[PDB]
Amino acid sequence: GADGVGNASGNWHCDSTWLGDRVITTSTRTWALPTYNNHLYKQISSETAGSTNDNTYFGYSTPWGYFDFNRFHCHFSPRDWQRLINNNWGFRPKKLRFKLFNIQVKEVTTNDGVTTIANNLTSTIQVFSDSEYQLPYVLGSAHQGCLPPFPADVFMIPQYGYLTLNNGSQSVGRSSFYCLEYFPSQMLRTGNNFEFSYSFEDVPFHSSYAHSQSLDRLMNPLIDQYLYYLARTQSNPGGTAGNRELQFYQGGPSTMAEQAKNWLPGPCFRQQRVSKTLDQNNNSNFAWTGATKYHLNGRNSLVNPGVAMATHKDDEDRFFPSSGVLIFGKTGATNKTTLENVLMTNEEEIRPTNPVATEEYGIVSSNLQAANTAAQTQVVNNQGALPGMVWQNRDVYLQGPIWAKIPHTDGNFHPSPLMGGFGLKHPPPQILIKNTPVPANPPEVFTPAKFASFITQYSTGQVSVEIEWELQKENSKRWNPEIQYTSNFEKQTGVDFAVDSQGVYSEPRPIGTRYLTRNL
Amino acid sequence: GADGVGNASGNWHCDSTWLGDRVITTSTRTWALPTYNNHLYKQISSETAGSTNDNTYFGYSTPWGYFDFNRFHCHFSPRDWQRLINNNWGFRPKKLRFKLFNIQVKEVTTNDGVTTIANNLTSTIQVFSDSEYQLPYVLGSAHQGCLPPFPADVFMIPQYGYLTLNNGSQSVGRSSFYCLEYFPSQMLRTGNNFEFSYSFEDVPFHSSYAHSQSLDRLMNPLIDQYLYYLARTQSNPGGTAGNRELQFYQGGPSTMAEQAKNWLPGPCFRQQRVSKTLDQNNNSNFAWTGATKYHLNGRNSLVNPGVAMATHKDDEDRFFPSSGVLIFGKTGATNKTTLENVLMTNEEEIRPTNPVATEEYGIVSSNLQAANTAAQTQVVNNQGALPGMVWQNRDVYLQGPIWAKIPHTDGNFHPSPLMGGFGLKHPPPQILIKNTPVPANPPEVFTPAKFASFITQYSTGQVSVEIEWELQKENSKRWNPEIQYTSNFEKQTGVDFAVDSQGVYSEPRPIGTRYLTRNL
Amino acid sequence: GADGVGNASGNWHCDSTWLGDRVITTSTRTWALPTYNNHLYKQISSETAGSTNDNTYFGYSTPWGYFDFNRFHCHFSPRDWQRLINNNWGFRPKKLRFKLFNIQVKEVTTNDGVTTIANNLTSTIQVFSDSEYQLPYVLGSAHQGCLPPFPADVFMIPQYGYLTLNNGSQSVGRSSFYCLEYFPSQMLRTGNNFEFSYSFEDVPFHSSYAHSQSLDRLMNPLIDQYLYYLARTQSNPGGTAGNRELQFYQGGPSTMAEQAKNWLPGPCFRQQRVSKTLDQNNNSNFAWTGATKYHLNGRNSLVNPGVAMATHKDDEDRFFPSSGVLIFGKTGATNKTTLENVLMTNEEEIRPTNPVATEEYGIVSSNLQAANTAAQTQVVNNQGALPGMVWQNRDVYLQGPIWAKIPHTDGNFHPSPLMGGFGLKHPPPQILIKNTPVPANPPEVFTPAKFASFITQYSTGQVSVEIEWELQKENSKRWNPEIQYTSNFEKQTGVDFAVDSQGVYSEPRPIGTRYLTRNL
Numbered sequence A, B, C: 001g002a003d004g005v006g007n008a009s010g011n012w013h014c015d016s017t018w019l020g021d022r023v024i025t026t027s028t029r030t031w032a033l034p035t036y037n038n039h040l041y042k043q044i045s046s047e048t049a050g051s052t053n054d055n056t057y058f059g060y061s062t063p064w065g066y067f068d069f070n071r072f073h074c075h076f077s078p079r080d081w082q083r084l085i086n087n088n089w090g091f092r093p094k095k096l097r098f099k100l101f102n103i104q105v106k107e108v109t110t111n112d113g114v115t116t117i118a119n120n121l122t123s124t125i126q127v128f129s130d131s132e133y134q135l136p137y138v139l140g141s142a143h144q145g146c147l148p149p150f151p152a153d154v155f156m157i158p159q160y161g162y163l164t165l166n167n168g169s170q171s172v173g174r175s176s177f178y179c180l181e182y183f184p185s186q187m188l189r190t191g192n193n194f195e196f197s198y199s200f201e202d203v204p205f206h207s208s209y210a211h212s213q214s215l216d217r218l219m220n221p222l223i224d225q226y227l228y229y230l231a232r233t234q235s236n237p238g239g240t241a242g243n244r245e246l247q248f249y250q251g252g253p254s255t256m257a258e259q260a261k262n263w264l265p266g267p268c269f270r271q272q273r274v275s276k277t278l279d280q281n282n283n284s285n286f287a288w289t290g291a292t293k294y295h296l297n298g299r300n301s302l303v304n305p306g307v308a309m310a311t312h313k314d315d316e317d318r319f320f321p322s323s324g325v326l327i328f329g330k331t332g333a334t335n336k337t338t339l340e341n342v343l344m345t346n347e348e349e350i351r352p353t354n355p356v357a358t359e360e361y362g363i364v365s366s367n368l369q370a371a372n373t374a375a376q377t378q379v380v381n382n383q384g385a386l387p388g389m390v391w392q393n394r395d396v397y398l399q400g401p402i403w404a405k406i407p408h409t410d411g412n413f414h415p416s417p418l419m420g421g422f423g424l425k426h427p428p429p430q431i432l433i434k435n436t437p438v439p440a441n442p443p444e445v446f447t448p449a450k451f452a453s454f455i456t457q458y459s460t461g462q463v464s465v466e467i468e469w470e471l472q473k474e475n476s477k478r479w480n481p482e483i484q485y486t487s488n489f490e491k492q493t494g495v496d497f498a499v500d501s502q503g504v505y506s507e508p509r510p511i512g513t514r515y516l517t518r519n520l
């Protein structure tokens, strides 16, 4: 920060720049930060509300807030998102630049119902980014409080709190307490501003393409293989009795399923099938009971969304996996809603390489046949990785999360966030912010005790974030036209992705990245 | 912006400088910007008020305001306007320079009827000019909110909203939504100021001259042409019977109308004739029913003012075209007034080259004559452009619009604004302004919802605009004195173009540019 | 040409290169040229088949063939055409490069039903491009014989013949005879190849954008004009009697139609309205009788397609102008078909700036009102260009013609081909080709007479054409998604723009260039 009160500390930048193979998206918002917990750290636990053995937790809640811009629609307008997914086979972030400026602090007083708000010029806020990843990382959990979709909106900064190890509702001795005033933090008055730059580590391009071939069909339809398979264990029946024979054919156009193949579909961890038409579902509650969930340290944790898998089969639109999809709300929807209010995403583009989430991986033989014994087989509901598997990660959506932090561990297998996006070992740091305490008048004779009495105040201002995205051009030689993302065209009562008569911005549908096709 | 609170960011400049062939006019005003729509974008449509099939509309309304200086009297004092039109055959703009400064922001509170206004030092405003013409262009539509005629007046900035395509009151899928926080915009506190410069593209000089000749009379009166015309299809009657003969004369002083001519009058699109003396008009409502209007996409849109055409005939002062004139209000006139309160402009100076707006273009033969058949002709009410036409664009008035933006299209014919002034493919950019939201105290526990609750505030300050005009000197050799624009001379209850006893500035009459004459 | 028989004279190039602001499209085909008219020039005329006064013609037919690549789908794959129109606001050609190579000549013999074809090594073909525009120009008339849509197709070169002035079926003395062996032409054996380069003259970008605003709605909806209009010619009726009064309002949000406007819709030349649902059409033949046609030199020539005008009104999909559209055939359609077999193009994107082709331009007052006389008005069916008109040229389609040659004349008004594309004063030259005559054995004693007896032969080979196209990028700030051209998505019996089970390439629908929007 340089100049004084009457000089703005930074300009509004919200813009998109499409140049060559890069796209530089800048977005600026206006934020407001309350005073959390009356400047106190409080240990929160599930002991207060009984809950259940699976939902128990122990942790801390802090006065600090934090900035979240982990969703795409923060950085992209629906138009810009349309250019991205129509013209390109992939994109990944490169650089990041972050600014706070035009900081204002207000003090508020309450007298007999009157609420008076006045500028407090000399009070400060505290901002620090954690570069060393020393704090618990609560980003990537898909919480709210991210910058709004719509530039003209104003948002409130969420509170920062974290969870640690526990036994029941108590605290095991490995539990950690992190005091956030124990880090260096820059203090900013109304003239000061805050800025830093960041550079993403190298990650694979996201795949914005949907394959035009399937694993089983990669063959050549016109030509007949030179590899035999075992066609029949009996002689061709003449209508009398089956007679033992071994007969081998060649894989060919007639029979593709029997034909030899180099590759296997991706792994699957299966989940229940739910239909959108109510009368086709069973009458019972199978939501939690018939759920697909993993058992960790005595806790049954629902598997959501789970391993990336095709949501439904070919001809079945209405079915969806119980836990296997990302689900979004329509504008103005509460936290408890019915089916019509949610926006449900499906992955139909991974059908070629991936199993259907609601169905088996395959079928495998469970016993040794003999003359007297008959061949038996069992179904494979779950399958780990086998040599020769290929798969496709879950798509990212305009509302979906951009990145998540790969935990620090001895090992991991093909880390990518199951919700979607870019797994990062060193993600964009957490930016934390707090209103510095201002004490109310002290008693005039010394007492050691804690104040607990402060001037109520809040601070507002603008925040801007600029990410440099890298692109991968579409090389395809396909003759016929691609699928594209297309606006409505026919007349309707109001425009999609635009404010209504009341000024409420609304997103009608989710938008995935996979339209353009390429060979498998 | 440079210095702090207690230092004025710019001087008052309102001045006129007449040097050589240029005139540099500077004008400065004090403006006030409210808070529109509580910082919201609202889709507006004709669905709310039923209206009629022609008046349906669909669009958006924005919190942003915009500066309009599209009228001449913004830049010209009546004296300066008098020098311009008396001494010159034409003028066109060259350069433009724009400044905002001395910006003040006020916060206002309402308690039990008391209205308290106090400075808010740290709050900002947002200003950006659209250089790339990316927004809808609402200038040139002759709306209100332009800088006042009179330097000592204070004005309020109009709200920015725009219209798009529609079907009925609904929105066709080609409708566009433009978020104006999606552009880079400079943010200004009380110490900051805003400035940019502009340069007009090359355009034809406006014609401030009224021709001293007419198309039909361009000939030499003393000499007799060598070209024959067909004088009579009968023998000169001796009082008995007409006898077929063909007879040719020479065009000469006796008969000028029959004489051969190189040029044709300008095009016309005809309109109804209305008289200012009530008893001469028909008793009926022909205003909308007998109107001259064009039919576009099922909508009947009145043609106003229409193609430039002489308002009345030679000896008829009282008649005026129904839609064919620009009409101004007298001081202190409501939006619904009678004839005496309007200031009605007439073009009598284009009578030489242009058709009369209330009368036919000509008469043309509709059939092939024969021995038995008699020659028939039909009237030409509308005429498109024909090779050999000359015409004069509508004059500009001290109250009239300076420029309009030529739409971006494949083709256009002789673009000039039908209201008047300079057609520009890249007009002066739109300068937009908004008061940055200041949030009221947030709830202290996190909620995702939109604030909707802000501190009510407005901002005021000064704006100055300086246009460099180029002139074309009067070369004429005419012996006798010109017509000029002359002040009243005889005593009257109050001065014209000056404040009355109540401080109300008033413009008594419109003033056109065409006085000086030149040969056709 | 350089090397000999056993060395190929050129490689196959069919490719598309998208780089920056340019797109370089190369296409190569295999052609076959018969022997026309037994090497004779024959005067053709309508005297042979009586026809009618409008269809009479006189001209010549030549042995020469000519290469036509005047349609877009020659140079563009449907995919490439999709990139073009989705990503860009305009495109125009820059350079042209043309090659003949791998020329083969075959001689054919017919004995008792056996058809024997053998190479003729020493025979030649003749090729010359007309750079000086000395020949009649038959390109741009939208004939057949253009390179096929589909690279793997083989096509036959059309015959070159031309028409001249005539009186009835006879020849006026101004008729011209052009012998095409009177030009320099390169002669090519199987080793030789032919090449030349060309550079387009500078032309306006085609407009691939559809306006998001309309002329009538360009105003600002929130603000009220300072210009009065004439609202009513009577006093507001109290239910007793109309009383003469003149009353003026301000143009404002309530009444947009009465509001003053700077611009006028494009010109129109009207045409009859036809409905696609048979029962709504009149029962009669109005095709030719009720047609819109122009009368030239006693000939009534249908106006097709005519001036660019919106095909139908807002809510009416089914109606189309009688002559006012370009009509394409579906695959495998004869030259006489019903409605279902044609592919009918509509311009709905010029509705904002252009009149509807089936409806009036406007309405205009035909008489001078008085106390006794009532105001009368007449409809404007045709309108020439008036100052202040803007319009949009007809769109170009993937099947449509690319260019046409602006005739050489004293004057023209806004030349653009009414069918579509780029008007050129010096278009790509006509490339002509012929098989040089090979005489059959002469009689062995001298006779002066014409041979008339030759060896029957034909020649085949490849032709490649490479055009360099320039692009105009899409700058728009529009928030919500654009309309795009999108493939079918849902399952269907066969792929669009691809061969069927029989190998027949087919184009399911026409594809226009106008999807992306911009402000008017």
Ligand SMILES: Nc1ncnc2c1ncn2[C@H]1C[C@H](O)[C@@H](COP(=O)(O)O)O1
Binding pocket: A203, A204, A414, A415, A416, A417, A421, A422, A423, A424
């Ligand atoms: N989302 C994500 N983040 C980080 N690492 C990943 C991810 N997905 C896969 N991988 C690992 C596993 C692959 O062996 C390798 C491909 O990197 P390539 O760059 O394609 O050669 O990268």
Ligand SMILES: Nc1ncnc2c1ncn2[C@H]1C[C@H](O)[C@@H](COP(=O)(O)O)O1
Binding pocket: B203, B204, B414, B415, B416, B417, B421, B422, B423, B424
């Ligand atoms: N108002 C306006 N704006 C822009 N272009 C116009 C206008 N009026 C006419 N023209 C065009 C049409 C004329 O052919 C030409 C005269 O330009 P000159 O400079 O006089 O040679 O300019």
Ligand SMILES: Nc1ncnc2c1ncn2[C@H]1C[C@H](O)[C@@H](COP(=O)(O)O)O1
Binding pocket: B410, B411, B412, C203, C204, C414, C415, C416, C417, C421, C422, C423, C424
């Ligand atoms: N199709 C076509 N070919 C050639 N000339 C045309 C065509 N359409 C319009 N014009 C002329 C008429 C306009 O005055 C001018 C615009 O050129 P601009 O380049 O846009 O300044 O070009």
